[PDB]
Amino acid sequence: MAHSPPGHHSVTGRPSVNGLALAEYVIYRGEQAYPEYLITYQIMRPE
Amino acid sequence: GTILIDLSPDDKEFQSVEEEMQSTVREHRDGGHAGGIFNRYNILKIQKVCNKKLWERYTHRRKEVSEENHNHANERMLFHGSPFVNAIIHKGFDERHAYIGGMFGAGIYFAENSSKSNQYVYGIGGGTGCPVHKDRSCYICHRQLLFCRVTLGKSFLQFSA
Ligand SMILES: COc1ccc(-c2cc(=O)c3ccccc3o2)cc1
Ligand SMILES: [Zn+2]
Known part of the structure; x- marks a missing residue:
């Protein structure tokens, strides 16, 4: 695993082209996330 | 140490998590290549993940980060x-x-977009799709995502395509 940029705890990937996309995030320490919910699902075929 | 507790669909907690997902x-931009073609999900089950040791590992780190960032963990779901x-x-x-x-x-x-994380359920780029039908757009097979509590602290902003 890489390290956070010096003086930072994570990276935020801000979308700069696709106006509809939301942000993505990266952490470099597994202890910085807790898996709170497990969601079981199917994708639905559009009508 | 992990137990999974089913949420009732009547539980406000189920409903708020479902609403974030949908x-x-x-x-x-891949036209559905990785994750499949869809506008919504059929939510089959939502379970709370309970593990005391893993939770304490998380909160210990959260406090370290908070203390390095003017008492602000910058916690997201x-x-x-x-x-x-x-x-x-x-x-x-x-x-x-x-x-x-x-x-x-x-x-x-x-990801903030559940559909972005959906692209990785079967692996990077959707891998070869579901194990049963080798279909990245499988409408039959059950998929699982995590909705996670994440400490960002001071986050480095990367503008990107
Ligand atoms: C270990 O291989 C993996 C596992 C998960 C991911 C993963 C999972 C994600 O949910 C994700 C969200 C936004 C951007 C990239 C993402 O990548 C990638 C590689
Ligand atoms: Zn399948």
Whole structure:
């Protein structure tokens, strides 16, 4: 695993082209996330 | 140490998690290649993941970060899709769950858009799709995502296509 940029705890990937996309995030320490919910699902075929 | 508690669909907690899942679907620039073609999900089950040791590991780190960032953990609830969801819920996130070739380097990646995390359920780029039908757009097979509590602390802003 890489390290956070010096003086930072994570990276935020801000979308700069696709106006509809939301942000993505990266952490470099597994202890910085807790898996709170497990969601079981199917994708639905559009009508 | 992990137990899974089913939420009732009548539980406000079920309903708020479902709403985050459904409301953050978007179209993707791959036309559905990785994750499939869909506008919404059929939610089959929502379970709370309970592990005291893993929770204490998280809160210990959260406090370290908070103390380095004017008492602000910058905590978010984000999605994570992975072939390793079963290991994660039992053993926690670690270096084995990192996206080695990710655009922001080898770390563990999370999304605001549930449909972005859906692209990774069967592997990077959707792998070969579901194990049963080898279909990245399988409408039959059950998929699993995590909705996770994530400490961002001071986050480095990368503007990107
Ligand atoms: C270990 O292989 C993996 C596992 C999960 C991911 C993963 C899971 C994500 O949910 C994700 C969200 C936004 C951007 C990239 C993402 O990547 C990537 C590689
Ligand atoms: Zn299938």
